[PDB]
Design a protein around this nucleic acid. Structure first.
Lengths: 147, 145
RNA sequence: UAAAUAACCUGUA
RNA sequence: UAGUG
């Protein structure tokens, strides 16, 4: 919102295949989310309409102990982490080209568990590693407490 | 978040068991004024009902000097650390089972009954603490100034 | 351009 | 053994 985060804006010419994946974290909670692409690619820098669909959006709030497990994987401390809750069933494994987060998640205003899978490769795996190793260290409230 | 600001940086290692409340505990690992403080909480009621799930049992206050020692273990250098006070006799060591995991076994008294307990640390909960401590020591040495 | 259906409060000694 | 915003 005015949180630590990084988004990957993948917009295609085929509106059905573009997405905006956002990874941000509030304190000890990581929020992984993805909205689909709403129709065509905007082309007017002045056009302030929605480019991604906030209604078919995928949102998943993870636990604090999870954020930890995720780093594990990045550090090979755990081959693959599998979390399970009411709204989704995901896995996060290391790949020779990056990371893979997948499972069956579910969009807002839905109850239709759909097969899902997002990937972080090359220069994006990097980006993601730094965000995670950082979320954790700052997830304890030391910086704010001493400020 | 107005409250989590002015409060003890801390991180809880959770192990509830509504199935068999004979293994229900919640440790808050906090750092209060150069104090790595452990609060082993016990489960007195289930997740499914309303109320205060956890109930605080014994509070082990750890002195600043310990961080480096505990870390010396979490980092694979020492094979164990010992704590001691008129109220506790606890131990943290590498759990032989799986690598990167650790066990904390504290045998506390209470005013003479020995309350003992034991909290395991999975490869992630270990990494959890591992960072929590590095941070403190970090600020303790006063780098944040 | 978020996310969304309420309750893991501390000190004191 | 004990008590409170």
């Amino acid at each position: 919102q005015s949180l630590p985060k990084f988004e990957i804006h993948d917009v295609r010419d085929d509106p059905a295949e573009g997405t905006m994946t956002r990874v941000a974290v509030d304190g000890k909670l990581l929020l992984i989310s993805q909205y689909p692409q709403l129709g065509p690619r905007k082309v007017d820098p002045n056009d302030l309409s929605p480019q991604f669909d906030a209604d078919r959006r995928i949102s998943v709030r993870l636990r604090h102990v999870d954020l930890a497990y995720l780093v594990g994987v990045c550090k090979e401390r755990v081959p693959r982490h599998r979390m399970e809750t009411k709204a989704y069933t995901l896995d996060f494994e290391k790949s020779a080209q990056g990371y893979h987060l997948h499972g069956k998640v579910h969009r807002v205003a839905s109850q239709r568990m759909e097969d899902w899978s997002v990937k972080f490769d090359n220069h994006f795996a990097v980006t993601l590693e730094h965000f995670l190793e950082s979320a954790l260290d700052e997830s304890f409230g030391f910086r704010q407490h001493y400020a | 978040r107005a409250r989590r600001a002015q409060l003890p940086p801390a991180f809880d290692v959770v192990h509830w068991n509504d199935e068999d409340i004979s293994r229900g505990h919640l440790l808050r690992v906090l750092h209060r004024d150069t104090f790595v403080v452990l609060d082993y909480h016990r489960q007195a009621r289930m997740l499914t009902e309303e109320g205060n799930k956890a109930e605080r049992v014994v509070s082990v206050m750890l002195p600043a000097v310990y961080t480096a020692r505990f870390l010396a273990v979490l980092e694979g250098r020492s094979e164990k650390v010992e704590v001691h006070s008129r109220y506790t006799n606890a131990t943290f060591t590498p759990n032989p089972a799986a690598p990167y995991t650790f066990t904390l076994k504290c045998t506390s008294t209470r005013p003479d009954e020995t309350f003992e307990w034991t909290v395991e640390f999975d490869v992630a909960e270990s990494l959890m603490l591992q960072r929590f401590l590095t941070q403190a020591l970090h600020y303790n040495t006063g780098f944040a100034r």
